[model samples]
Every structure is written in structure tokens, then in C-alpha cells.
Target: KYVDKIHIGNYEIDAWYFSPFPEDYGKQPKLWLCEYCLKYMKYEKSYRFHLGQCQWRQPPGKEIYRKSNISVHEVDGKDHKIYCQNLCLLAKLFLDHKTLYFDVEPFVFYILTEVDRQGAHIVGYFSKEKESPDGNNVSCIMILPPYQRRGYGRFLIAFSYELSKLESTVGSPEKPLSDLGKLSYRSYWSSVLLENLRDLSIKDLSQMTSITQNDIISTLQSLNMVKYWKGQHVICVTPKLVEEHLKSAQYKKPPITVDSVCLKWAPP
Candidate 1:
């Protein structure tokens, strides 16, 4: 996945997104993901240079983004080309150089943004289509650096499958995921599968929580998340494959309500 490798503090980063520039100082020994710019840097001395100069600006759409209990807006790309492209440009800053370019119209964008006392902040998002190229429901996904590891990424992953279930189709993310993308999805699959399989006997559950047995089975069938050997359901959601999330997503997480989101297209 990487053409080069290096260390950042005690952590290792293999896919340095940007190539080293021609300064010729030959400082290829170190590189890190900037907490502010989200770009790669070769040295803390240079990183320190950025800290002095980093704009640390917020993502686009803080000016006019809308919010609600499940605050994701289903964007029609043609109607919102400028904002969508702006979002793509922002994602370009951190994604692999080899990925494809804009064709937003054919796809639907589920943007994850939140409005607070401060303003509407873009947390993360994913793009997909009812009919996808790879038949992968999730074509692209992101969680802003400031918001990573807080479970938004997992939520997006699960959200993708929830849509797949709504579509009544089985799916997965498109191939060649970024390192971080792979990890987040692994966690999502584990958590979703585990919780769904928590009680095969539904003698005691209801709207007390939102996911249903049919929903769970559909998701499992979609991912092939389980298997039937002679007489038992063997879980394919293995630790070797991935882990669970830190916190669970909800129907009424403030500024983000999901359980009752009305669908114009049945998660397709």
C-alpha cells in the first residue's frame, strides 16, 4: 500500500500521501499527518514551521449547512455541484493520489455535519449510489482528522450498510480502501454483527432500540457477514477481520436523528 515507510513519534505511517518536494535537504526520514492541515510533513522542524503558519480552517458549508436529529442531508449532486466539489477538494487533501475524480451527479452524498452554538461543522461523509460500479454501497468515506477515532467513522460505515439493507441489497465498500478506512469498517462490521446476533430469540425486544431482526438478517446477508455450516450459524465477523466501536450510534443523538429518517428511496 505504500511506496515508502517512516515513523511519527512511536507510530508508523506507511502511505505518506504527498511526495517529498525538491528542497533537496534530504529529510525523508520522518513524516506525519498534520493535526491542523491534515497534510503530510517530513519533519517536525517543518511541522513546527506549519504550526506557525497553519490556517486550521474549517471545512466548507459551515455558512449554510442545515441540521436536524439525524442531520445528514441527502444531497443531489447536480443541485449542489459547487459544495460537493468543494467537499471533494477537501477530501483530496487526504486521500490517495490514485483515486478517481468527480462524477458526483450519478451518486448521492450523505453528508455528516452538526450545528452547535458555534456553527455547522462538517464531521464526516460518504458517497454512494443505488446502483454502484462495484455494487459497493460505500464508494468513499471520510471523518475529518479532528473528528477521527471518536466513532463517527464507524457510524458512517454502519450507515452505509443500513442503507444497503433499506435497498434490500448486499454490499461492501469499494476496493483499495485507505488504511484508516479499512480499520474503521472492520470495527463497524464487528459491532453491527455482534449486536444483531446478541439475541436470536426476539421474545423480549422492541422499539426500546431501533434495529430489527429482519434488518439484522438483511445486513448479514448483504455482507455475507455470517455462514451456515451443517447446523449452526458461524459468525464471519472475526477479530482477525476487525473489532467493535467505542460508542454506539442512536436514533436521537442530538443534531442527528436516524431511527425515523423518512426515506424517499428506501435506503436504495
Candidate 2:
């Protein structure tokens, strides 16, 4: 038994991978989800009725960052267990290696939404372990299929690093990155390294941003911008190289990057 499709908000989306929905729900060909609260139902009528009366207009969380029509909600998994679990289920359909579903108590979920007259509709979300042993800022992340390719993935990645910087620590994503996660992360890492290295050495760069040395080395190596001289790793990034990288097809500047000045969040 499995769900092949889901109707959430105004979009009917196909599932890319198997999700561990409830047994009765998995028997249905399609699942109905309330976008505001992420509640799942087996019947369309139940969903429609729920939608009509559902009190939640936006995600049930604290509005942490709001700029223009886009906002981010910070939800504690322990506080909103059902919502976070439903979110993980939805995200698992798109994320190949999403491992946390029932065990959401240790995480904090950051939900990214597109706001309008109707409400704040979720575009994507990233979860962070409240006590990550490895300094992993993002444990699981996903941008809904309909919202993909709009630079939201980069914004999510950028936001995680911003949080790390706010917390006064260098951070990396949890290991075993999905293929698409690897791509997005590498792209973000490349842009961050190239843009920042122009003004400082790698050591100083590490001090200035929440990028780890290992992350910097890996990104530089992947871009072919690192060389070995004697026993030291030498960076070969230049002004022209940076400009070329920025102009290349591989580099896409996110339409919305985190503006720290507008953020009203403290490290939790």
C-alpha cells in the first residue's frame, strides 16, 4: 500500500518516493493535506471540510523572518509534534534519505513560506537538530516540487549558514547528503567561498563566516581553485575567476538571500 499523489493547498503533486504514511492512508491512491497545518486525511471530503474550518492560516510557529512576501517560521518539533511529523512525511516523499519522522523532538523546523492575502503558503523547510553533535545546522531540507528552480533551495541553504553565524559556530549539513542536496550545497558553497575569499585568506575567511575549513577546502577542490604548494594548500581564486564563476551557468544568485538586519532571531 502506497500513496501515488497528494493534494496540498492548490497543487496536486506526484510523489517521487515512498512515504510511511498511516496504513489506511497508504492504501489510498491520493492523500489530502492541509497546507496550513500539514494535517493529512484519507478522504477528499474530510480534507475539504477540514480546510473550510481549519483555523490555521499560516504555519503554526513563530514568525522569525519576514521580508516582503516571503517569511520564515521557526517551529519547535517538540511543541508541534503532529505538524512536524506531517511535514517530515511530506518532505520524505521528495527527500530520498529523510530518516527522522517520529523522532522530531530533538529538532527545530524552519518553514519557508510565500505570503499573500490568502495566507503564508509553505514553499520549503529545513530542520536543525537542537543539539547536533557534529555542528550540523541542517538535518533535512526540501523544496516542494512545484517550488523548485526558483532559487528557494539556495535561500534555504543560505539561511542555515546565517543561523550558524548567529550561533557563533561553523556548520555543515548532516552527512549522507541526497544527490540533489549535494548539488545545491556545492553550488552554495562555491558561491560563498569565491565571493568571500577575495578579501581574506582561508584562515581569516573561516573566522569571518560560519564556513568550516573542511567545507572551504572541499568546495575549492571541487571548483579546481585549490593547489598544493610545499605542505600548504594554496587558493587560486582571483578577481577574474570570481567574476567568471558568477557569470557562469552554474552560478545562480538567489533572488532572496537572508538580510541579517531584518532578522529578529537570537540563537536558541
Candidate 3:
């Protein structure tokens, strides 16, 4: 289908507004496609804007916002089975590093899923504590293996950011920092791993947003999304930086820091 003609889920979305296309063709008659997603956006400028802001858009279904899916009820006996499954997966992925079966505390797990014809995909989970006085203890996040490469991770991250903002406004209590932030900060301070640097580097970001590498680097730095440390072996972006990145488009250089990246909201 052409730009402005495709449908997403049940929504008759304006594909031209969501995808990127050539600019010179002049409005509705022009044809443009994203180098990445291969979808068409009617105008070059709109495509660029979509590339920059698409990460924060909602998931493709209303199920994501359902009360049962995004609730914050205390983990307890009623959720024991779900909690156990999630905890086991995390422990296997981290602690044992052996992929062995295990269990976790119910109170430590918050689960959310997206159900559609393709099957159900886990969309949110928070297993960490909140650290900042203004942050949340929940570690909400969504992890879908097959969907990983399609920008769902970025969507989940953005979703989590909104959740945190909501919590702050609702006068919710703060939680502890995530284990990922805690460990990386204390022992591996001032290091930017090559892999991580590449992930956050100008070239990689440009590939995602169509913004120039210099501009990407500038934006990341300005928003504190990229930090240098320990011969560039370990780098991290604080939750605050991630939040700012979602809010603004201007690029600025970030200050070098040895501290860990921290966020107060759950990952989704």
C-alpha cells in the first residue's frame, strides 16, 4: 500500500504521517519510503519527525492500557505463579548465568502482556527498587525476543518513562534504583564498553533517526544520553537523561561522568 493508505491493527492510520517519503514530489502525489522500516511517509520532513518521535508512540493495541495489564497492586500469593516464572527467568539470565530453573519473590514482580492474533507478548515487568526520592520502586519493562529488532524496546522504554511521570504526578512513593544501574555504577565506574559505545554512538543513532551523526552525538550528549568513562569501556545514560531525550529534539554534548544511569520508573 502507499503512504496514507495503510491500516495498523484496527486503526485506519495515516501511513503517510507515520512513514518517511521523498519531499520534492509535493504533498499527496509524492512517494517516499523509510530506509529502515520500508514504510512510506508522504513528506520528507514528516518522515524525519516520525523517525525522531515514533519511539514514544503507544503500542498497537488498547490492551496495553487495560487496568489488569498495567496495574500496580502489591505482589502476593495471588500472583505467585506469574511471579515465580518471571523471577526464575531473571535469575537464570543473571545470577546463575546458567539458564537453570529458579523462583523469585512474588512481591518483586509486576507483569504486563499484549495479546493479539500473533499470541501474547510480555510487555512490562519491574523487579528492581526505586533509588531517587522522586522516583518509583517498580521496574516496569517489556521484553519480547522476536520483536526486539523492530523498535519495541524503545517503545517500552518510552512507555516506562510515561509511567514514571504519571507516578510522580500522582504522589506515588519512590522506589530503589535498578540492579543494572547499581552494579554498573559502583564497580565498573568510568568505563564505556565498545559495544555500548557503538550502541549509543552517533553513527548508530543516526541510522535510527536520519539525523546527522554530529547532531545525534550532540543531542545525546545534551540530553545526557551518552557518557564517557574508563577508557571508554563502560558508558551509561541516566534515567533523567533518557527522560530528557524523550522531551526535546535539540542536540547537545553531554558531560563526561563516572556515575551510573538511574531511573525511578518501572520498565515497560
Candidate 4:
């Protein structure tokens, strides 16, 4: 039987699907995970003992960004094999798509966390290939259920694009996005397109932001913000459309955001 729930630090989270954590203990009713190290245990007593000695205060990686109470750590799959594998297992609990738990040497994970006196607890994360042959900026992404709708997912999406902008390359997430991934992306695309289309032509927007032309068209079409007229894709920016965008955009403009100025990473 698959694990139906897991206890991670202070949160008791429900699992969405099966994860290949390990046959021996992965099938337990309620798995316990070390929030910092992502180590899974079948019993609370063992997990509690491990947590007491886990020593890690945060993710084992370089601190790439930190602002206020949030921080992002970049961990290399090749360098932190066990940790990355454990991370994939954790992500798989919520992600229905294929998540690489092994053979992760070619990817880099950006772990997002909320910092407090106890420590930096994982809120969510996204991983991308170190050298994606297909220009996929994000391979897999997930936000813990407790943290959903708090703008962290959108922030992670925006951060991925910011990385692309910095690299001076157009980027897209890997294909066959999960249902939630598509929803979050569509919302992000709406806001980015609406905010920029006023000043820039569609061509210029892609040129400046490095968002692919197809991504631009897809976003507008999906939102019914564009129409095909005379064999040309024409954008419709009527007042009502703007109002609709605002309706969805207002709640998305909450506190979470990525500050490019504070981003200390370079294209590698």
C-alpha cells in the first residue's frame, strides 16, 4: 500500500500519489520526514531522533537569494545525491508527473524556504537541467499543500523566468505540465503579458523578456485575450478584458515576489 500521509516537522501533509521512497518503509501509513534533510522514516520515534541530530540548519547548498524571511538555496544534484533523491521523493508525494529520484546528476534544484528561529523550512521547490538540451527552465515544480495559493508558486514561476532573462535565453517548462502547473503558469503568463503588452509589441515583449513567441500566443489565446482575424493573430485588449485580468491579477499581487536585484546568481 502507498503512504497516504506524511509528517514533516510541524505539518502533517496528505500525499497525492505514490512516491518511490523505498519499498520497506515507503508503504507506511504515516511516514515522517526530516524537513531540513528530507530523510524519511517509517516511525515517529526514529524520525524524532534523526531530527535532533540532523545538524543541518538549512538546505545543503549555496545561498543564492535571501530577503526578509524567505531564502532560496541552490543545490547541485551531483554534489548532494542523497539529499536530492530525498527531495525528489518528497516532491513526488504531491506531483503526479514523473520526478527523477535517481540519475539526477544533470539537474540543479532551487529550494525555497521560510526562515524562522527554528530554521528554514521548505515551502516548495523547482528543478531544472544544468544544461537543458531542450531549453526547459523548470523540469518539475511543487508547492506544499499548506503553502498553496499564498503566491509562492507564482513567485517560483517568475523566478524561473528571471533566470532565463539573466541567461539571455528563452525558456519554457518541460512538457506535460501537471494540472496545477498549468493553472499557475497561465496566471503568471496573464500578468506578465498584460503588464508588458501596453508598452511593447508582442514581438518586443518576447525580445526583451526572453519569453518565447509561442508562449506569448498561447497565453493570450488561452485567456480569450486574442482572436484570429484575416489570418493574423490579433490581440484584443478591450476594457472588459483588462477588468477580467485585474480580477485575477489583484489577488496575485500579494506579498511574495522575486527581486532580481537581490539575485546573486550568474549564468553557468
In order, what lDDT does every prediction score? 0.53, 0.88, 0.35, 0.86
Q: What would the TM-score be for candidate 1 when compared with the true structure? A: 0.55
lDDT of 3 at 215: 33
TM-score per candidate, chains pooled:
0.55, 0.95, 0.31, 0.93
Candidate rank order under lDDT: 2, 4, 1, 3
* Evaluation by TM-score, superior candidate among 1 and 2: 2
Candidate 1 lDDT by residue in tens digits, 12-107? 544335432234322465445443234456676776776567664333322222325334557666766655664554465456742543566776
lDDT of 4 by residue, 38-133 (tens): 888999889978987999879999989898888999999999999999899889889888657888899899999999998999999999999989
Worst 10-residue stretch by lDDT in candidate 4? 246-255
| Candidate 3 C-alpha error for residue 150, in Å | 1.8
Preferred candidate (TM-score higher): 3 or 4: 4
Leading candidate by lDDT: 2
lDDT of 2: 0.88
Which digits, one per residue and each the tens of the lDDT, describe model 2 over residues 137-182?
A: 8999899999987889889998998899889998888888978888
Worst 10 residues of 1 by lDDT: 201-210
List residue ranges in candidate 3 displaced over 4 A: 1-64, 67-78, 85-87, 94-103, 106-108, 117-119, 130-142, 169-268
Off by over 4 Å in 2: 252-254
The residue pairs found clashing in candidate 4 are none
lDDT of 2 at 205: 71
Task: Report how far off residue 247 is in candidate 1 (Å).
Answer: 12
